[PDB]
RNA sequence: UUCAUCUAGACAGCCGGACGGUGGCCAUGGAAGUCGGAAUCCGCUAAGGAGUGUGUAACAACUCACCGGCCGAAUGAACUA
């Protein structure tokens, strides 16, 4: 146990002292081919290390030493962070790490990324669905044999965790809002941190 | 014109069962027939190994594309005698292959792939090899893993 | 009593995920990480087991180990009388 904990000092340690900037990544909500995807295009241009925030924590208070700039680092890394260290461009970093956004199915309990609406449009279903339609009470009419919604309603936003009647109504409506993607909180670059933005 | 794919798992130039291709294919009106000569053709050289044959159904062409399969590709290098399903069940496997030919397989499957370093690529191949259990260049593709872990086997990386 | 885990976050709970190759190969009538048979393959790894199990004819899909977040300092096991 102390033996792999000394290893991951050592590759945090490593990372601290031959990449010049590092951006804190958030992965909540985040899935394994995701960050599997920002790797790969990150590949040579930043590399990705991840882990328990007192593990790093820890890591920096002992870096602190010989490094005094990490105590501005020490209060930022906090919730599912880690770090995406990098030699290169700052702005086409970040780009390339937030790019990678993986439509996912709204599922029950799952704070919505955004507000999801139910946007008018003939979606073709029946009676089955327009079931869950009326039990969260959107004005929904059997088109030919195909729902329409008459009115749009502001059923879910961020936060606001999806029931599973939202869930199953937004699955029938065939919507995957949730584009889960890895976040930025803050940028280290040369001792200097500074907000994302 | 609409954008459609569909998979299967048929045996290698082995004519596919209309019992095994009409359920899938049979709605999207699609001729099976079809669908299986054009299987066989794409298996031409996998013939007797079973692999996975993509079809994009673009306004209803049976246009058979086999995608590359690291374990049937290392058993077509192993070149054994098409699997005789009739002589005897689970035929075992046993294949030579150099590892030039397993290179060649990492460098034919790292195009969606996901392995650092076509090192890495090699070892995953490496692996499916070893879940095969055929011994390669009169070794275990475990050791030749290890191996390739310790700097032994120069990777030649292009 | 002895052996362990533990602020470099222990056990419990809750929440999020739990991969790519790969629905891996072999086949099972049908197995899709899991009725199943060998190896528990490489990479990315915080983690992910060819998977822990469930479900399904199979699926689709979940779920757990596992990893994170919270939490805050104790906890687990085998014994003795």
């Given at each position: 146990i102390r033996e792999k904990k000394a290893e991951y000092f050592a590759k945090l340690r490593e990372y601290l002292e031959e990449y010049?900037?590092?951006?804190?990544?958030?992965?909540?909500?985040?899935?394994?081919?995701?960050?599997?995807?920002?790797?790969?295009?990150?590949?040579?241009?930043?590399?990705?290390?991840?882990?328990?925030?007192?593990?790093?924590?820890?890591?920096?208070?002992?870096?602190?030493?010989?490094?005094?700039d990490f105590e501005k680092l020490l209060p930022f890394v906090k919730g599912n962070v880690g770090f995406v260290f990098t030699n290169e461009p700052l702005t086409e970093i970040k780009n390339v790490i937030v790019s990678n956004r993986v439509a996912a199915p709204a599922r029950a309990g799952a704070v919505a990324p955004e507000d999801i609406w139910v946007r008018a449009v003939n979606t073709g279903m029946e009676p089955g669905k327009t079931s869950f339609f009326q039990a969260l009470g959107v004005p929904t009419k059997i088109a030919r044999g195909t729902i329409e919604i008459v009115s749009d309603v502001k059923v879910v936003d961020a936060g606001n965790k999806v029931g599973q009647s939202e869930a199953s109504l937004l699955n029938l409506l065939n919507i995957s809002p949730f584009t889960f993607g890895l976040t930025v909180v803050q940028v280290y670059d040369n001792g200097q941190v500074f907000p994302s933005s | 014109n609409e954008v459609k794919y569909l998979y299967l798992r048929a045996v290698g130039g082995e004519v596919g069962a209309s019992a095994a291709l009409a359920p899938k294919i049979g709605p999207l009106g699609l001729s099976p027939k079809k669908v299986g000569e054009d299987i066989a053709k794409a298996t031409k050289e996998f013939k007797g190994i079973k692999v996975t044959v993509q079809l994009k159904i673009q306004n209803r062409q049976a246009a058979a594309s086999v995608v590359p399969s690291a374990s049937s590709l290392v058993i077509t290098a192993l070149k054994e005698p098409p699997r005789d399903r009739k002589k005897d069940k689970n035929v075992k496997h046993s294949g030579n292959i150099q590892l030039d030919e397993i290179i060649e397989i990492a460098r034919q499957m790292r195009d969606k792939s996901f392995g650092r370093t076509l090192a890495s690529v090699t070892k995953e191949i490496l692996g499916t090899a070893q879940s095969v259990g055929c011994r390669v260049d009169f070794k275990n593709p475990h050791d030749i893993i290890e191996g390739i872990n310790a700097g032994e086997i120069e990777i030649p990386e292009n």
């Open positions: 010049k900037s590092l951006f804190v990544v958030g992965v909540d909500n985040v899935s394994s081919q995701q960050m599997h995807e920002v790797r790969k295009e990150l590949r040579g241009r930043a590399v990705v290390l991840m882990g328990k925030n007192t593990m790093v924590r820890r890591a920096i208070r002992g870096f602190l030493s010989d490094l005094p | -």
